[PDB]
């Protein structure tokens, strides 16, 4: 019904996607050799979104990896993959995987914007598969360089993806330094955090809830004009080891750790900017009165920092299955005109990409 083809591009995209598969095989309950272990009936309900089976029930993910490669197979869930998808002819394997699908919903891409692989190979991959399949949504998780290469990829990315997020690894360091109290933040913990927030927007696909919202509902509900699709992720219930039982896991605390600034995943202060639109997809057992109240109380009191000409900036989606251990969790995606603060820093550091970035920044500027 709604299947997702996963694309890993570049060096860091391979790690981000591999540990996304860590998480997705974890809370679906999938044995690393391929098989499923059996407790519930909600885990094996919508595995066609991300997995297709081999004989004997061994589920292999619908992922093709293109760039390091030997280090992925040495990982925990490194043997979950089919060996023929180690493409290092990418168009051939992705079109075979799309042909075997029932009815494709879109593509998932993990790559970087600060090298010759994610920006060079991956953006050409997007340009090819968008031209082949123009009636789907291009979900691209992009790691951006710190504002404090990138130009040559964004000017062709704007025409293609219609759905993209900036990661801003210094904001992940800000998370793990300020709001987590972890003395030794591995790269693994950082992109574990981004995998946890990236599996947080595809929850309605795989689990039933009370207000379902696929990736296309988000695409129509946070894109008002066909080029402004630069978002700003988040993931609220993150607390320190010494503040574990000091938390009342309620909707109020989750809302506050949504709309705070340090929890967000961009190196931009949202006060110069204004939130064009907001989507806060909720996971677990929330009473809808509480989500309903705190998804507009922030709008009512913080009105000088929300955009006019939209009577309702927010979007609410609620599932019924939380992640492991936690009981209530939720994920932020949002369009803000503070995204251009990164691009003003990038533009100061051939001609058509510079001109396109300037026009995009001016386009984000006039709505503010």
């Amino acid at each position: 019904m709604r299947e997702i083809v996963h694309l890993q591009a570049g060096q860091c995209g391979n790690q981000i996607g591999a540990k996304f598969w860590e998480v997705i095989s974890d809370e679906h309950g999938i044995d690393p050799t391929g098989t499923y272990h059996g407790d519930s009936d909600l885990q094996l309900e919508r595995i066609n979104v991300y997995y297709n089976e081999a004989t004997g029930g061994k589920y292999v993910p619908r992922a093709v990896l293109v760039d390091t490669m030997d280090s992925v197979r040495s990982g925990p869930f490194g043997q979950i993959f089919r060996p023929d998808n180690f493409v290092f002819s990418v168009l051939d394997v992705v079109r075979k995987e799309a042909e075997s699908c029932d009815c494709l919903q879109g593509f998932q891409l993990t790559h970087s914007l600060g090298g010759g692989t994610g920006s060079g190979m991956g953006t050409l991959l997007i340009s090819k598969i968008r031209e082949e399949y123009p009636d789907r949504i291009m979900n691209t998780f992009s790691v951006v360089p710190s504002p404090k290469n990138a130009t040559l990829s964004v000017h062709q990315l704007v025409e293609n993806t219609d759905e993209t997020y900036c990661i801003d690894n210094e904001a992940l360091y800000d998370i793990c330094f300020r709001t987590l109290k972890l003395t030794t933040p591995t790269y693994g913990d950082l992109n574990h955090l981004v995998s946890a927030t990236m599996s947080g927007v595809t929850t309605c696909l795989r689990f039933p809830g009370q207000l379902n919202a696929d990736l296309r509902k988000l695409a129509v509900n946070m894109v008002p004009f066909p080029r402004l699709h630069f978002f700003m992720p988040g993931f609220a219930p993150l607390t320190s080891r010494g503040s574990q039982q000091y938390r009342a896991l309620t909707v109020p605390e989750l809302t506050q750790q949504m709309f705070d600034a340090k929890n967000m995943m961009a190196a931009c202060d949202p006060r110069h900017g204004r939130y064009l639109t907001v989507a806060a997809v909720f996971r677990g057992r929330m009473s809808m009165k509480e989500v309903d109240e705190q998804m507009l109380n922030v709008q009512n009191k913080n009105s000088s920092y929300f955009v006019e000409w939209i009577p309702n900036n927010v979007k609410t989606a609620v599932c019924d299955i939380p992640p492991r251990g936690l009981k209530m969790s939720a994920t932020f995606i949002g369009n803000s005109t503070a995204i251009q603060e990164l691009f003003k820093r990038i533009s100061e550091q051939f001609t058509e990409a510079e001109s396109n970035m300037n026009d995009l920044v001016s386009e984000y500027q006039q709505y503010q």
């Binding site: 506050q256 709309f259 705070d260 600034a261 340090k262 929890n263 202060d269 913080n302």
Partner: peptide, 6 residues
């Protein structure tokens, strides 16, 4: 809010 230095 939660600001940036706060």
């Amino acid at each position: 809010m939660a600001k940036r230095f706060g």
